[PDB]
Amino acid sequence: LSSKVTSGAASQFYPNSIYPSLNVEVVQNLYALSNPAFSSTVKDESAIKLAELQKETER
Amino acid sequence: EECMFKDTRLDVLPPQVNPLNAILAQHTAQTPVHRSLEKRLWTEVRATAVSE
User: Fold this and answer.
1) Looking at the partner chain, which of B17, B29, B33 has a beta carbon nearest the beta carbon of A46?
2) From the CA of A18, how many Å to the nearest CA of chain B?
3) Residue B44: closest CA among chain A residues belongs to which residue?
4) What's the Rg (C-alpha) of chain A?
5) Which residues are within 8 A (CB) of A28 and not within 5 positions of it... i.e. 6 or more apart?
6) Sign of dihedral through CA atoms B3, B4, B8, B9?
7) B45 near A CB under 8 A
8) Cα separation of B38 and A8, whole Å?
9) Which of B16, B21, B36 sits opposite A50 (nearest CB)?
């Protein structure tokens, strides 16, 4: 799943309805619920290579 | 020829290189990325295990 839709058709049936015939639609994305964690050395020839590989992985 | 009458220990010192960096580098080069993310999951689940 990617999105959630709503539909307020029951406002016509609601008593003392302030919103009769509410023909609109709300759509909300879901990537936070699907992935809450989305928000988140002397120039040697070894440590800089390690940093490069770690950066590639994170990339 | 006059090597005995000198002190070049400062001219020649042992390097401060950590071989662990080359070892972890060869480990990352051998491993794939999904295992790295799995290891991040193992660490997170271990954190929750220590929490509970």
Assistant:
1) B17
2) 48
3) A37
4) 25
5) A3, A4, A6
6) positive
7) no
8) 42
9) B21
Q: Looking at the DSSP assignment, which residues form a beta bridge with residue A57?
A: none
* C-alpha angle A16-A18-A21 in degrees, rounded to nearest 5: 105
Q: Which residue of A has its CA nearest to B35?
A: A57
Q: Determine, for residues A47 and B28 on separate chains, whether the beta-carbon distance falls below 8 Å.
A: no
- Alpha carbons A23 and A9: distance in angstroms, whole number: 7
Technique behind the model: cryo-EM
What is the stated resolution of the deposited model, in angstroms? Answer: 4.3
Give the amino acid at B43.
T
Q: Which helix (H) or strand (E) holds B48?
A: helix B33-51
Instruction: Answer whether A50 sits within 8 Å of B36, measured CB to CB.
Output: no
DSSP letters along A2-50, please? -EEE----TTTTSTT-SSSS-----EEE-HHHH-GGG------TTHHHH
Does any CB of chain B come closer than 8 Å to the CB of residue A48?
Answer: no
